[PDB]
Design a protein around this nucleic acid. Structure first.
Ligand SMILES: CN(CC(=O)O)NC(=O)C[C@H](N)C[C@@H](O)CN
Ligand SMILES: [Mg+2]
Ligand SMILES: [Mg+2]
Ligand SMILES: [Mg+2]
Ligand SMILES: [Mg+2]
Ligand SMILES: [Mg+2]
Ligand SMILES: [Mg+2]
Ligand SMILES: [Mg+2]
Ligand SMILES: [Mg+2]
Ligand SMILES: [Mg+2]
Ligand SMILES: [Mg+2]
Ligand SMILES: [Mg+2]
Ligand SMILES: [Mg+2]
Ligand SMILES: [Mg+2]
Ligand SMILES: [Mg+2]
Ligand SMILES: [Mg+2]
Ligand SMILES: [Mg+2]
Ligand SMILES: [Mg+2]
Ligand SMILES: [Mg+2]
Ligand SMILES: [Mg+2]
Ligand SMILES: [Mg+2]
Ligand SMILES: [Mg+2]
Ligand SMILES: [Mg+2]
Ligand SMILES: [Mg+2]
Ligand SMILES: [Mg+2]
Ligand SMILES: [Mg+2]
Ligand SMILES: [Mg+2]
Ligand SMILES: [Mg+2]
Ligand SMILES: [Mg+2]
Ligand SMILES: [Mg+2]
Ligand SMILES: [Mg+2]
Ligand SMILES: [Mg+2]
Ligand SMILES: [Mg+2]
Ligand SMILES: [Mg+2]
Ligand SMILES: [Mg+2]
Ligand SMILES: [Mg+2]
Ligand SMILES: [Mg+2]
Ligand SMILES: [Mg+2]
Ligand SMILES: [Mg+2]
Ligand SMILES: [Mg+2]
Ligand SMILES: [Mg+2]
Ligand SMILES: [Mg+2]
Ligand SMILES: [Mg+2]
Ligand SMILES: [Mg+2]
Ligand SMILES: [Mg+2]
Ligand SMILES: [Mg+2]
Ligand SMILES: [Mg+2]
Ligand SMILES: [Mg+2]
Ligand SMILES: [Mg+2]
Ligand SMILES: [Mg+2]
Ligand SMILES: [Mg+2]
Ligand SMILES: [Mg+2]
Ligand SMILES: [Mg+2]
Ligand SMILES: [Mg+2]
Ligand SMILES: [Mg+2]
Ligand SMILES: [Mg+2]
Ligand SMILES: [Mg+2]
Ligand SMILES: [Mg+2]
Ligand SMILES: [Mg+2]
Ligand SMILES: [Mg+2]
Ligand SMILES: [Mg+2]
Ligand SMILES: [Mg+2]
Ligand SMILES: [Mg+2]
Ligand SMILES: [Mg+2]
Ligand SMILES: [Mg+2]
Ligand SMILES: [Mg+2]
Ligand SMILES: [Mg+2]
Ligand SMILES: [Mg+2]
Ligand SMILES: [Mg+2]
Ligand SMILES: [Mg+2]
Ligand SMILES: [Mg+2]
Ligand SMILES: [Mg+2]
Ligand SMILES: [Mg+2]
Ligand SMILES: [Mg+2]
Ligand SMILES: [Mg+2]
Ligand SMILES: [Mg+2]
Ligand SMILES: [Mg+2]
Ligand SMILES: [Mg+2]
Ligand SMILES: [Mg+2]
Ligand SMILES: [Mg+2]
Ligand SMILES: [Mg+2]
Ligand SMILES: [Mg+2]
Ligand SMILES: [Mg+2]
Ligand SMILES: [Mg+2]
Ligand SMILES: [Mg+2]
Ligand SMILES: [Mg+2]
Ligand SMILES: [Mg+2]
Ligand SMILES: [Mg+2]
Ligand SMILES: [Mg+2]
Ligand SMILES: [Mg+2]
Ligand SMILES: [Mg+2]
Ligand SMILES: [Mg+2]
Ligand SMILES: [Mg+2]
Ligand SMILES: [Mg+2]
Ligand SMILES: [Mg+2]
Ligand SMILES: [Mg+2]
Ligand SMILES: [Mg+2]
Ligand SMILES: [Mg+2]
Ligand SMILES: [Mg+2]
Ligand SMILES: [Mg+2]
Ligand SMILES: [Mg+2]
Ligand SMILES: [Mg+2]
Ligand SMILES: [Mg+2]
Ligand SMILES: [Mg+2]
Ligand SMILES: [Mg+2]
Ligand SMILES: [Mg+2]
Ligand SMILES: [Mg+2]
Ligand SMILES: [Mg+2]
Ligand SMILES: [Mg+2]
Ligand SMILES: [Mg+2]
Ligand SMILES: [Mg+2]
Ligand SMILES: [Mg+2]
Ligand SMILES: [Mg+2]
Ligand SMILES: [Mg+2]
Ligand SMILES: [Mg+2]
Ligand SMILES: [Mg+2]
Ligand SMILES: [Mg+2]
Ligand SMILES: [Mg+2]
Ligand SMILES: [Mg+2]
Ligand SMILES: [Mg+2]
Ligand SMILES: [Mg+2]
Ligand SMILES: [Mg+2]
Ligand SMILES: [Mg+2]
Ligand SMILES: [Mg+2]
Ligand SMILES: [Mg+2]
Ligand SMILES: [Mg+2]
Ligand SMILES: [Mg+2]
Ligand SMILES: [Mg+2]
Ligand SMILES: [Mg+2]
Ligand SMILES: [Mg+2]
Ligand SMILES: [Mg+2]
Ligand SMILES: [Mg+2]
Ligand SMILES: [Mg+2]
Ligand SMILES: [Mg+2]
Ligand SMILES: [Mg+2]
Ligand SMILES: [Mg+2]
Ligand SMILES: [Mg+2]
Ligand SMILES: [Mg+2]
Ligand SMILES: [Mg+2]
Ligand SMILES: [Mg+2]
Ligand SMILES: [Mg+2]
Ligand SMILES: [Mg+2]
Ligand SMILES: [Mg+2]
Ligand SMILES: [Mg+2]
Ligand SMILES: [Mg+2]
Ligand SMILES: [Mg+2]
Ligand SMILES: [Mg+2]
Ligand SMILES: [Mg+2]
Ligand SMILES: [Mg+2]
Ligand SMILES: [Mg+2]
Ligand SMILES: [Mg+2]
Ligand SMILES: [Mg+2]
Ligand SMILES: [Mg+2]
Ligand SMILES: [Mg+2]
Ligand SMILES: [Mg+2]
Ligand SMILES: [Mg+2]
Ligand SMILES: [Mg+2]
Ligand SMILES: [Mg+2]
Ligand SMILES: [Mg+2]
Ligand SMILES: [Mg+2]
Ligand SMILES: [Mg+2]
Ligand SMILES: [Mg+2]
Ligand SMILES: [Mg+2]
Ligand SMILES: [Zn+2]
Lengths: 112, 101, 116, 59, 140, 154
RNA sequence: CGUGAGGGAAAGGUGAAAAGAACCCCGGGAGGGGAGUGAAAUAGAGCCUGAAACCGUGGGCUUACAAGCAGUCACGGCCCCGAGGGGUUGUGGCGUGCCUAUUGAAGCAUGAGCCGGCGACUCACGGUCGUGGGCGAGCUUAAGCCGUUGAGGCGGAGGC
RNA sequence: GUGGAGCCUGGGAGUGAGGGCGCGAGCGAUAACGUCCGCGUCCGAGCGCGGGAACAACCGAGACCGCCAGCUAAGGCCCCC
RNA sequence: GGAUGACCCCAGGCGGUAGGGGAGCGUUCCCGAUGCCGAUGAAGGCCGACCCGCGAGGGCGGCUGGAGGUAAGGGAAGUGC
């Protein structure tokens, strides 16, 4: 049994969040919570909410046990980028891409 | 007991029971053909000069096929020369039945 | 009427990309880089088909030569031997004999020696 | 200077090999002897406020 | 029929006494042994050659004035880093290197040719330590 | 490229912008630009020789005649403009709808009656043409129609 | 966008029907997980199909003594599908991108980041060969006219 | 001498920067990967194949496709090969 | 050879840039079509180690897709990057 949460269109660049997600992949829910709590990254806030929301789904919707949950899979996909104009010298305009993330946490039950 | 036979401009080591694909033989499937013998080995060793006189290898022609397609492709640079040719070499599949001598 | 590209160019591009499956980096992903790789691939295949016939013969010849020197002669003398004897077993089968049927190969050495 | 510029696009392989050093190391944590909660060593425990066995901080 | 390829065989260890033999004319044969080209099942893409132990490498022989005139050469990568060492001194300092350099040059280039060189065991002096693998003496 | 809405302004200088040289955006190299040799209003008609159409018209009828697919009639019995009436008549004449029929008659009532039949193309005799004869498997004609046909290939 | 004359875009598609997802759950929200609707919800409004570049997660094979236009030929190994095949690639052989322009380019000469779509020999009227037919000392109509409403006929002025 | 010979009529071209090499000269200095003609050749268009270490035009030879068959060419046959 | 393209045999040719010629494939549209295929699934998409074709391609099968598509034979071009 699996329980999933997806935070779509989070306004953080995928590459940067993936760093944080990479940390908790394959971890127990409890270790992941602890790791996230002291990860000095903006991304740790968002991953935490998805982790935490995936947990709730496991318990509330999916007859899974909180004491048994681990991060089965987790990944970040790119959402549509917010393109923004960055004014440069000599009349030139760059386009900054304020990138966007879809954050997915999938929890499984580690039995016993 | 094996034999070195010649068919299709090539030579082969054959033994009874061996399935062999050779160059296409003009022969209806099911039929049998006698292959020339260059050498005999195993218990007797007889050496053709070039082919041993009384000897043959009886082979049943299982049927005729076409090889898996090879893409023969030619390219010449800076000259717009390109050629794409599909080749399927025709073949005959033989069942080596017996070595006579 | 208007006959726009539509479905066609994509399909041709797919034919080429499929042929390029396995190729490194863009050479399997980019139609253009795949195209180019296949040109080389096609000639190489042609060249090497021809060159395979040479490779195997040179392989056989080395194997025959080793087997010959065990019996006291060299490849060139041996081949002149089978010639004078009128023995026509080719290097493909000679080399097989030299490994699988040393006794038969031994016999041919004798005949070769005898012929000169 | 004369504005140096990349000569070739970095291949995915060369790009991804640069980042072979980019993995975060997980926060190093120890259990607080008072409340058994996980926190960084050598810090006042944010869970119960204790450090060096005594209460140092409201939480 | 397809050409035979050998499943892996036990490599034959071999012993050669280099004393009084000509450097290059000996290297030839060691190189051939190393490749296993004396073997009827020779296969060019595997190492099925012999292991070759050579003793009295220090007593290898050389014609003409090559003792003083044959110069081994090393480049360090550094400005002016071309070092020159004559056969005389090479023999008087690292005699085994003389025969090693000869055989190495007559080996194929590439991974396999590098492995094959490791199968060469050259020794100055009459003795060798590979008594364990019991090398068969070869007259060459 | 000259009939398209855009201005004829050179969009950027010819040199030193590091971009491809262009003129106006009506150029066909531009998306939204003109089309190079696209269709223009055209007249596909041409004067096929009168003798040739006369001959073809003759040969088309002949072909049906040669198969026995040509039928002439004196009149059309109880068909007075009702489709069901033509159906009745058609049955009697061996026209069961199993084959397409080119119905050629100057009688307007008859044409009105057979007209809505899927298997019947209908024509006034002055309109006999080889396309319609070949399209259809059978030629059914007024004796009146047969005359103008005969005059026509006269 | 331009002082202005003027320049001048992009942007279509849920579903048969809103039945446009009550309510519960995590979340500040966004978002999501259930529930419900629907034939279909990877038709959920960022809505038909949903290619490619591109990014990522999982797996198979492989890779830290090896020298390169990245392939190709051979053999072996491993994995998969069920004397065969597919994937992978260890070693060995061979191997100077594509296009353009040139006497000559892998060329250290041009162009191209990559992908998708747009993108260049046409039409009219004359001409001239060839060709498929019609008629042949003759061939042919033009404009118009009548007819049709995807029906054809007339029209000999004129042209050759 | 029956050849992708030739002749005749007509349709369509492209080309009208050549280059190396051998031989015959001129120019140059009995210089030039020079230059300009003649005869030939090859590359051009045979940067396809073998040899020449590598290398358009030097030697060998004109690649319709396939073969894990054979003979040779130049060049080779101590090892790399 | 048979008897005019039925296929079969014999022989000889078949490197190729500019270029000439020939035979084909595919795209849009028209006649064929008041037809035919189609929810028992159109077109398109994603696969295929299968079949046919020298090739351009065409089939077939699985998945997707959800409503179109269109033969033999001809016709016409905004026809292949
Ligand atoms: C280190 N490896 C792998 C590699 O370099 O690709 N090296 C080789 O395999 C050398 C080998 N001679 C490459 C050839 O097999 C390529 N056809
Ligand atoms: Mg940290
Ligand atoms: Mg919970
Ligand atoms: Mg983004
Ligand atoms: Mg600034
Ligand atoms: Mg400014
Ligand atoms: Mg940018
Ligand atoms: Mg950018
Ligand atoms: Mg940017
Ligand atoms: Mg055959
Ligand atoms: Mg090829
Ligand atoms: Mg090239
Ligand atoms: Mg080209
Ligand atoms: Mg090129
Ligand atoms: Mg060229
Ligand atoms: Mg080309
Ligand atoms: Mg072909
Ligand atoms: Mg075969
Ligand atoms: Mg187009
Ligand atoms: Mg299109
Ligand atoms: Mg396309
Ligand atoms: Mg497609
Ligand atoms: Mg690919
Ligand atoms: Mg690969
Ligand atoms: Mg690549
Ligand atoms: Mg790739
Ligand atoms: Mg990659
Ligand atoms: Mg890709
Ligand atoms: Mg090719
Ligand atoms: Mg070939
Ligand atoms: Mg070759
Ligand atoms: Mg050969
Ligand atoms: Mg040998
Ligand atoms: Mg001979
Ligand atoms: Mg022979
Ligand atoms: Mg054995
Ligand atoms: Mg400076
Ligand atoms: Mg500077
Ligand atoms: Mg400065
Ligand atoms: Mg700078
Ligand atoms: Mg990657
Ligand atoms: Mg890097
Ligand atoms: Mg790391
Ligand atoms: Mg010796
Ligand atoms: Mg070896
Ligand atoms: Mg070897
Ligand atoms: Mg010496
Ligand atoms: Mg000396
Ligand atoms: Mg110096
Ligand atoms: Mg305008
Ligand atoms: Mg305007
Ligand atoms: Mg203007
Ligand atoms: Mg204008
Ligand atoms: Mg203007
Ligand atoms: Mg102007
Ligand atoms: Mg400029
Ligand atoms: Mg630029
Ligand atoms: Mg530009
Ligand atoms: Mg630019
Ligand atoms: Mg411009
Ligand atoms: Mg323009
Ligand atoms: Mg314009
Ligand atoms: Mg437009
Ligand atoms: Mg526009
Ligand atoms: Mg009708
Ligand atoms: Mg009809
Ligand atoms: Mg009608
Ligand atoms: Mg304004
Ligand atoms: Mg618009
Ligand atoms: Mg809708
Ligand atoms: Mg609607
Ligand atoms: Mg609620
Ligand atoms: Mg709440
Ligand atoms: Mg919500
Ligand atoms: Mg959720
Ligand atoms: Mg929801
Ligand atoms: Mg339902
Ligand atoms: Mg259904
Ligand atoms: Mg779907
Ligand atoms: Mg969708
Ligand atoms: Mg849908
Ligand atoms: Mg979208
Ligand atoms: Mg729709
Ligand atoms: Mg990618
Ligand atoms: Mg992965
Ligand atoms: Mg080393
Ligand atoms: Mg290693
Ligand atoms: Mg290389
Ligand atoms: Mg490689
Ligand atoms: Mg091999
Ligand atoms: Mg395999
Ligand atoms: Mg393999
Ligand atoms: Mg070579
Ligand atoms: Mg190499
Ligand atoms: Mg130029
Ligand atoms: Mg130039
Ligand atoms: Mg020049
Ligand atoms: Mg280069
Ligand atoms: Mg370069
Ligand atoms: Mg330049
Ligand atoms: Mg370049
Ligand atoms: Mg230029
Ligand atoms: Mg260019
Ligand atoms: Mg750019
Ligand atoms: Mg790319
Ligand atoms: Mg034209
Ligand atoms: Mg036009
Ligand atoms: Mg004209
Ligand atoms: Mg004309
Ligand atoms: Mg004409
Ligand atoms: Mg006539
Ligand atoms: Mg007239
Ligand atoms: Mg008049
Ligand atoms: Mg000719
Ligand atoms: Mg000629
Ligand atoms: Mg012509
Ligand atoms: Mg001209
Ligand atoms: Mg010209
Ligand atoms: Mg001129
Ligand atoms: Mg000139
Ligand atoms: Mg000249
Ligand atoms: Mg010339
Ligand atoms: Mg000249
Ligand atoms: Mg010349
Ligand atoms: Mg010269
Ligand atoms: Mg001379
Ligand atoms: Mg002169
Ligand atoms: Mg010159
Ligand atoms: Mg000169
Ligand atoms: Mg001169
Ligand atoms: Mg040229
Ligand atoms: Mg050449
Ligand atoms: Mg030539
Ligand atoms: Mg070159
Ligand atoms: Mg060469
Ligand atoms: Mg060479
Ligand atoms: Mg050369
Ligand atoms: Mg040169
Ligand atoms: Mg030829
Ligand atoms: Mg030939
Ligand atoms: Mg020979
Ligand atoms: Mg010779
Ligand atoms: Mg050898
Ligand atoms: Mg070589
Ligand atoms: Mg060629
Ligand atoms: Mg040709
Ligand atoms: Mg067509
Ligand atoms: Mg229709
Ligand atoms: Mg039906
Ligand atoms: Mg249904
Ligand atoms: Mg279905
Ligand atoms: Mg369509
Ligand atoms: Mg279609
Ligand atoms: Mg297909
Ligand atoms: Mg399908
Ligand atoms: Mg489908
Ligand atoms: Mg409809
Ligand atoms: Mg149609
Ligand atoms: Mg058709
Ligand atoms: Mg028609
Ligand atoms: Mg049209
Ligand atoms: Mg166009
Ligand atoms: Mg494109
Ligand atoms: Zn605490």
């Amino acid at each position: 049994m699996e329980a999933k949460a997806i935070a779509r269109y989070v306004r953080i660049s995928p590459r940067k969040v993936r760093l944080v997600v990479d940390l908790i992949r394959g971890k127990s829910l409890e270790e992941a919570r602890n790791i996230l709590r002291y990860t000095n990254k903006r991304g740790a806030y968002f991953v935490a909410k998805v982790l935490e929301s995936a947990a709730a789904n496991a318990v509330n919707n999916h007859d899974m046990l909180e004491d048994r949950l681990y991060v089965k899979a987790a990944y970040v996909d790119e959402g549509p980028a917010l393109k923004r104009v960055l004014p440069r010298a000599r009349g030139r305009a760059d386009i900054i891409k304020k990138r966007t993330s879809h954050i997915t946490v999938i929890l499984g039950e580690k039995h016993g | 007991m094996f034999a070195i036979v010649k068919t299709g401009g090539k030579q082969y080591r054959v033994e009874p029971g061996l399935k062999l694909r050779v160059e296409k033989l003009d022969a209806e499937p099911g039929a049998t053909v006698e292959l020339p013998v260059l050498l005999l080995g195993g218990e007797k060793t007889v050496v053709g000069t070039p082919v041993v006189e009384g000897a043959s290898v009886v082979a049943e022609v299982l049927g005729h096929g076409r090889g898996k397609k090879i893409l023969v492709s030619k390219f010449k640079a800076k000259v717009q020369y390109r050629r794409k040719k599909g080749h399927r070499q025709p073949y005959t599949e033989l069942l080596i039945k017996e070595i006579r001598g | 009427p208007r006959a726009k590209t539509g479905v066609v160019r994509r399909r041709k591009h797919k034919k080429i990309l499929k042929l390029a499956k396995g190729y490194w980096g863009l050479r399997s992903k980019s139609f253009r880089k795949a195209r180019e790789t296949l040109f080389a691939a096609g000639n190489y295949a042609y060249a090497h088909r021809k060159r395979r016939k040479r490779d195997f013969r040179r392989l056989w010849i080395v194997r025959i030569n080793a087997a010959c020197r065990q019996h006291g002669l060299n490849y060139s003398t041996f081949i002149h031997g089978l010639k004078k004897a009128g023995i026509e077993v080719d290097r493909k089968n000679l080399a097989d004999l030299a490994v699988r049927e040393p006794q038969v190969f031994a016999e041919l050495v004798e005949r070769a020696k005898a012929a000169q | 200077a004369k504005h140096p510029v990349p000569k070739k696009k970095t291949s995915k392989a060369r790009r991804d090999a640069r980042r072979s050093h980019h993995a975060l190391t997980p926060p190093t944590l120890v259990p607080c002897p008072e409340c058994k909660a996980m926190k960084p060593p050598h810090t006042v425990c944010p869970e119960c406020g204790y450090y060096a066995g005594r209460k140092v901080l409201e939480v | 029929m397809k050409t035979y390829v050998p499943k892996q065989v036990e490599p034959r260890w071999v012993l050669i006494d280099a004393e009084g033999k000509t450097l290059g004319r000996l290297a030839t044969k060691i190189a051939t042994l190393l490749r296993g080209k004396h073997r009827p099942d020779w296969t060019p893409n595997v190492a099925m050659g012999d292991f070759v132990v050579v003793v009295n490498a220090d007593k290898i022989r050389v014609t003409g004035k090559k003792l003083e005139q044959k110069i081994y050469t090393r480049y360090s990568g550094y400005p002016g880093g071309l070092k020159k060492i004559p056969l005389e001194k090479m023999l008087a300092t690292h005699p085994e290197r003389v025969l090693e350099h000869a055989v190495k040059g007559m080996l194929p280039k590439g991974p396999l040719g590098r492995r094959l060189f490791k199968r060469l065991k050259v020794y100055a002096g009459p003795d060798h330590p590979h008594q364990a693998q019991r090398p068969e003496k070869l007259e060459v | 490229r000259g009939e398209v809405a855009y201005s004829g302004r050179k969009i950027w200088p010819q040199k030193h912008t590091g971009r491809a040289r262009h003129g106006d955006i009506g150029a066909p190299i531009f998306v939204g630009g003109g089309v190079v040799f696209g269709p223009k209003p055209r007249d596909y008609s041409y004067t096929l020789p009168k003798k040739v159409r006369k001959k073809g018209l003759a040969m088309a009828v002949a072909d049906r005649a040669r198969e026995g697919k040509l039928l002439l009639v004196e009149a059309f019995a109880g068909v007075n403009g009702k489709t069901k009436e033509f159906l009745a008549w058609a049955k009697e004449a061996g026209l069961d709808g199993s084959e397409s029929v080119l119905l050629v008659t100057g009688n307007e009532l008859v044409r009105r009656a057979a007209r809505n039949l899927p298997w019947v193309v209908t024509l006034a005799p002055e309109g006999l043409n080889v396309y319609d004869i070949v399209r259809t498997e059978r030629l059914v004609m007024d004796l009146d129609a047969w005359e103008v046909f005969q005059n026509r290939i006269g």
